Amino acid sequence: GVYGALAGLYLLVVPAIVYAYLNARWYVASSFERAFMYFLVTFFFPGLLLLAPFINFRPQPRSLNS
Amino acid sequence: VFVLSGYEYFLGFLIICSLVPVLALAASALLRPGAWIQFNVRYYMFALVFVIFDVETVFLYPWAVAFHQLGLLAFIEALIFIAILVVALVYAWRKRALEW
Amino acid sequence: PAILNPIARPEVPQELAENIILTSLNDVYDWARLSSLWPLMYGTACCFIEFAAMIGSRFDFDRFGLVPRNSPRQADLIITSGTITMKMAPALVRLYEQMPSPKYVIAMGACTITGGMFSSDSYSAVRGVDKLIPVDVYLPGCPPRPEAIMDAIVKLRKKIANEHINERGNLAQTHRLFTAKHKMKPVPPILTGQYLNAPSRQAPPPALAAAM
Amino acid sequence: MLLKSTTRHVHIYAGHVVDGEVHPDTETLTLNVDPDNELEWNEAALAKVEAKFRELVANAAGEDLTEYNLRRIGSDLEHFIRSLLMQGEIGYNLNSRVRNYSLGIPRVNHS
Amino acid sequence: LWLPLPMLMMLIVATVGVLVAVWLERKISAAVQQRIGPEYIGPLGILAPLADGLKLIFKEDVLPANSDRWLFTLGPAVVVIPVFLSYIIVPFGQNLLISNLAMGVFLWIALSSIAPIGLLMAGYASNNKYSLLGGLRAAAQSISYEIPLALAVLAVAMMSNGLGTVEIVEQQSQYGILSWNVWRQPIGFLVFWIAALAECERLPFDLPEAEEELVAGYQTEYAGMKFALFYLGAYVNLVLSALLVSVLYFGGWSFPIPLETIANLLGVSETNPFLQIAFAVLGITMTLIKAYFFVFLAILLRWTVPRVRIDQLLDLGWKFLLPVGLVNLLLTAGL
Amino acid sequence: GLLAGYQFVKDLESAGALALFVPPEGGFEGRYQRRLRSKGYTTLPMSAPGLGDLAAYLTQEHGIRPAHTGKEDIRVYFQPPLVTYHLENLPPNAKGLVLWLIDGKRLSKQEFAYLAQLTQTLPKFKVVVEVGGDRVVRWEPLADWVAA
Amino acid sequence: MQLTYVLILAALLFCIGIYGLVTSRNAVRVLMSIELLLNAVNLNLIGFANYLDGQQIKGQVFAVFVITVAAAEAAVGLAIILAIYRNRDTVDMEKFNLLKW
Amino acid sequence: ATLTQTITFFALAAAVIIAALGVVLLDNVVYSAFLLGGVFLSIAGLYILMNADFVSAAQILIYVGAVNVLILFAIMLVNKRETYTPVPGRWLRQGGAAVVSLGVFALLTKMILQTPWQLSSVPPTPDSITTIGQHFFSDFLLPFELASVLLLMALIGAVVLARRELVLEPEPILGEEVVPPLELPERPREP
């Protein structure tokens, strides 16, 4: 086990990229992108479990233009 | 003398997986606040056919591991063991043993 | 006197003090209970279809975290879904007694709040299920919409997060037992388990089949 | 069979309690008032209902052993427990995690 | 206190392996009904396996009235210890093995035989009528699907000249995908896969009692932390049985040269820092890419077949899976 | 964010009348009526649409008319005024009480300021009127909200 | 642990099986007490194979056949008790003394 | 590193003899039957300590997984809730069995210690699944083929002695003089 060089590549910096990827294309992704989407969560799961209560996917408040 | 290799971690892993329920049920212990079954002889009958066939599997595991270093005469002899215990299997279907 | 049905003053001081860490480990306790409370699959009357529609596709039940479990030992939440009569009254308090100790009943529909249309004259409906079990969240409507039942769960998640970890002594029932000996004559039971092979169906009785 | 009557403030069973596991008898009746603690009791009114519990078992000791008769007693205890509240003897609990006030609201006497 | 480094690193990937399979159950089974799944907890449901199991700790694990006390508590501790001990077999990675036992696909079938006693001392001790009817039925289902599963491993041990699970997956590492055992044992793999699915998955199990032959199964009177061992101890065996599919038949840690285009389930550019960590952890764990395809399959196969009754469940293991398990062993031999 | 300190306790004693903007699924509102209640403040969570005119309900005795359902007379139950009755019960060894109103977004703008100008005129008494929805729970005094 | 301590373990595991073979009143507890005797002849047998004739184990082969016999003797053995229980509705070894003299 | 093979021997040798007293002396038979798996697992722990990796893995499969499941089904089938507790039935013949069992034990220990065993200092088990399988098909071949004949007979016999007689229970087949169905024709009679 690497102390802090290769561990942070798996635990922190790459799962933070997937959470940006998970927010953007999850409901609008195609039939091929969705099956690849479930693989990165089933692989970076001890990474994505750490930065779980820091990011909230709640929708942005609307502007009420009417 | 102990010439088995690979069993040094088996005694440690036997204790730690045994410490998975006894410590978690104790970790929960500090955080928490006309009776008839009918005698149907099929629970015995499904288990008898297991014992006759859990023993057949044990007898074929030295054969299967040491097969490709034995030859054909040890395959004719090991075919008698399988072909007889097939007749034990046809006897169980036909005599309604494992019917449920 | 002065006040009918008075409120007893809290003489206990409620010294509920803790540091930051024990209220940080209390946030994990309260979050993990409100977010995954499993409902009992209970339903009697018309307000079960309103709740069974929420299990399905158009409204997701298991989106707040509610996986329905059909036995009172695994489940904790129980949505009182439909009219309770005089029968099904002790079959419901038996359903409530056999649950692990943070239970949180919610009421549902106008019939478990007051006995909605069966308050005026019905000879067997328990008017409101708070006569039987303590309810956490009420919910009127006849039936409530399946958008409105997920509102009462939203109000219930506001009730779990208030709950304190060291106030778990009131989550266990008390024992104010008494014992009296009666002089009632015991009777044999009425409903034994025989319908077809009862010896009253196989033949018509005498002195009545002559004119039959 | 364990005939019983389980209301909210009253749990009349037909049998005597031997350390949690109730055994059904033919002679005795167990009663525990307020298993959930909604009303904050005191020393006197836990003994006042014994003047109504042992009265109602003795006065109705000529009828059958049905759950209609165990309910008919319990519907008179829970109408005596309310008459304690409308006389102001006992009061509601405030440590209780639920606050539905099932026996009416607190109200003042004559405006 | 677990001073072995390999023994702690395995106990985490046997713990995070459960929470993957719980979360994958609530999102694949919610995809096939056209609903969201558990939102609102974590980002999109990632904390649904944490929070479902953490609430099971904080409940009053109370007994029923007249029950055996020492067998109620020891009920779940016999179902889950041998399926947790038998993770000592699976050698995920080229440069990782916890213990090289000279057998181990025979030690796994040995240890998986103790689990019918754990369904027996839990069905008996909970002490109502509908848990003896459900306990004796759940015990008589791991019985029937155990001889077909032990003969699928007999065939793949004939080809491998051993039972050591490194020596099995080393015989499939010479040709990458040409020498996986599925291509040479296409009828002993379905015998493994149907029998393993019929010992731990949720299609051939009487726990959802929408058919009402019993009340709610054998885990009816269980609650709290004891129920968490029957629930978060069923996916421990779903992962291990899916691991041993991707160890025995499909080659564990075996795959050709990764130097390809962007269509290799990864990013875009060739030499990024993102593909070097999608290779090096794959140079540490290659099998849990394969092992989370059958967990993806076993969840998806739950909604594909109808709920077969117990009268036809044991008319599958004895009358079909065992005779096919025999003739596969002879066909794997010469005859 | 995640780790909340005790700033919600000192913000309520300073302003006197808060306004919480919680996520509309609930569950994260109530972690702030626990730090409030750990510091001696009791909490009376009422309902905002259920309250009538807050002059007649909070500080005055009000006649709650029960449902007669055709089988009774028109009774009038004169309940005691809620804020003065629930304060006389609580001993002065603790602090006052709050009124954690839920579904507060259906009170009129006049009844917001009446819940603002009453928490100063009444000593050791506060309100936390939960109003509106947001992605993250955040608070502000009611003095700024009625002018918004 | 030497060879001697396995044998005194096997010789003690035998004689608890004897005490259950003679004193037990359930018809099934005699069958479990028979299985203790058929393990003490296994614990004697592998222990004779490890320290004596270690290179070619003739004891661990002979230890295999004792398990398969006793598994086949307890499969026959419980079939007999289950034939008695359908006729005589108890299992009491002080109730099967009708073939006395 | 060697004293942890002695401590784990005496902790397994005390795991069997406290469970072996449990399968004999305990008052309930289901608690007696479940502890029989404690005997069979702990004995299987000793076989690994005696360098018998295959005979241990074949014992958890048969004795714990097949025989002990066979015992437990055959006790849930006979409970009947009628123990009748006639403990002083006729005499104190449970103390006469404590003398022969203690007599055999003191007899065997005198035999074990004083007998010179010719223990060899060679390393055992050169992969004892290969030299146990070259015994099944060279030397121990005829006991291996007779184990197949024994097991087939044990399935013919144990089925016909435990199956239900739902084919024809009232079957008066024939007669010279009267015979009941499925019974030996020598009718019971007292002189």
Ligand code: SF4
């Ligand atoms: S109030 Fe009406 S809709 Fe609601 S449960 Fe009763 S009958 Fe059904």
